[PDB]
């Protein structure tokens, strides 16, 4: 139904680019509800696709998470990397801005003045967030405001609001993070989510707080698991399940811990 692109392999998922060529459109900060952004989208994709917003953390701009724009969009997604209204915004505000940015993509898909006209399926929305942007992403997931969530070294004041999330949620934890220490953020966030929810935890060995932002030594792993997550849950594309459920991920020197509720 929603599956697109060729049958995946490990090499295909590890490559810097997926099989679609992509284009970009800039969104001015004048946009209501967030600080503007960059839309990345496939050029020759038939029909509608899931849409994903990617948000950075405290004191950071869109460029800090830009890897995720081309990496997801080149696999058949409409992906907007955003700025927040202020770089000092906290996770509750970031949650609202992710929601506003997804609404913007849905609305532009219905506008005859948009280059992404007809590209977004409003039923299929995801978010990816780093640090406080990950707290915002998990907060939106707690309302079922998204169909898939990825947290990149997430930071939030508490885990206690996350105990009923049903949104399929992947958390990348950076083992040696001193800004959002895994023991106080990523790990309790993952453990708070119900065991009946599709969820996964990938802790990157030795990882610094920026480890899951990509454009770095972990690109093959980050994109493989992140794309597979969005394919499996936003596209219901079961071809991607074997990359997430089955492998002994911890054998990889880059993965110090893996948890999941596989099989999904
Ligand atoms: Cl918070
Ligand atoms: Cl760090
Ligand atoms: Na704005």
Note down, in words, how this protein is organized.
It contains six helices and nine strands, in the order H-E-E-E-H-E-H-E-H-E-E-H-E-H-E. The chain has one domain: Rossmann fold. The chain is 24% helix and 22% strand. Helix 3 packs across helix 4. It is α/β, with parallel strands linked by helices and 264 residues long. A nine-stranded mixed beta sheet has the order 1-2-4-3-5-6-7-8-9, with helices on both faces. The longest helix has 19 residues. Bound molecules: chloride ion (2 copies) and sodium ion. The site of sodium ion has 5 residues, from loops. One of its GO terms (molecular function) is carboxylic ester hydrolase activity. Keywords: Hydrolase, Signal. InterPro entries: AB_hydrolase_fold, FrsA_esterase, PET_hydrolase/cutinase-like. This is PET hydrolase/cutinase-like domain-containing protein. It holds the Pfam family PETase.
């Amino acid at each position: 139904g929603y599956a697109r692109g060729p049958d995946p392999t490990e090499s295909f998922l590890e490559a810097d680019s997926g099989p679609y060529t992509i284009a970009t459109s800039n969104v001015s900060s004048l946009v209501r509800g967030f600080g503007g952004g960059t839309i990345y989208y496939p050029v020759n994709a038939e029909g509608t696709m899931a849409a994903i917003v990617v948000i950075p953390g405290y004191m950071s701009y869109q460029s800090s998470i830009s890897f995720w724009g081309p990496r997801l969009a080149s696999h058949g997604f409409v992906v907007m990397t955003i700025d927040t209204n202020r770089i000092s915004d906290q996770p509750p505000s970031r949650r609202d801005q992710i929601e506003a940015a997804l609404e913007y993509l849905v609305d532009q898909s219905n506008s005859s003045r948009s280059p992404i006209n007809g590209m977004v399926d409003p039923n299929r929305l995801g978010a990816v967030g780093w640090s406080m942007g990950g707290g915002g992403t998990l907060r939106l997931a707690a309302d079922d405001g998204i169909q898939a969530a990825i947290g990149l070294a997430p930071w939030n004041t508490s885990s206690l609001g996350f105990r009923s999330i049903e949104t399929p949620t992947l958390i990348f934890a950076c083992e040696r993070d001193s800004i959002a220490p895994v023991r106080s953020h990523a790990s309790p966030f993952y453990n708070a989510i119900p065991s009946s929810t599709d969820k996964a935890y990938f802790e990157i060995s030795g990882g610094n707080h920026y480890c899951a932002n990509g454009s770095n030594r972990y690109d093959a792993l980050l994109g493989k698991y992140g794309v597979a997550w969005m394919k499996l849950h936003l596209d219901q594309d079961q071809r991607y399940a074997p990359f997430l459920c089955g492998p002994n991920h911890e054998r990889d020197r880059q993965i110090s811990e893996h948890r999941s509720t596989c099989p999904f």
